[PDB]
Design a protein around this ligand. Structure first.
Ligand SMILES: [Mg+2]
Ligand SMILES: [Mg+2]
Ligand SMILES: [Mg+2]
Lengths: 49, 49
């Protein structure tokens, strides 16, 4: 044209990349506060009642 | 080594004669013997043994 940024967009400069990556869907995480956490010694077990 | 022989009855001032050790060889060719075992991490942790 004459010298326009849509001509020289990859030759005279490089497009801005914003340094913050925007987070997607975050699920609500509550089980650890909202229940009793048993650190088990086996995968299969039983609890006496 | 060659089998053992007997020293020679010899005159006095007479030449000591040669019966030297003659040699041969036996080859070794060592074969690789291998055995493996695999265990899951869960199994390695849970075993009483
Ligand atoms: Mg059970
Ligand atoms: Mg002689
Ligand atoms: Mg001999």
């Amino acid at each position: 044209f004459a010298a326009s940024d849509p001509e020289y967009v990859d030759t005279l400069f490089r497009e801005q990349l914003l340094e913050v990556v925007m987070e997607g869907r975050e699920l609500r995480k509550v089980a650890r506060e909202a229940s009793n956490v048993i650190n088990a010694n086996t995968r299969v077990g039983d609890v006496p009642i | 080594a060659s089998d053992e022989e007997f020293a020679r009855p010899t005159g006095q001032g007479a030449e000591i004669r040669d019966d030297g050790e003659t040699y041969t060889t036996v080859a070794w060719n060592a074969t690789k013997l291998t055995e493996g075992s695999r265990v899951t991490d869960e199994m390695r942790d849970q075993a009483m043994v």
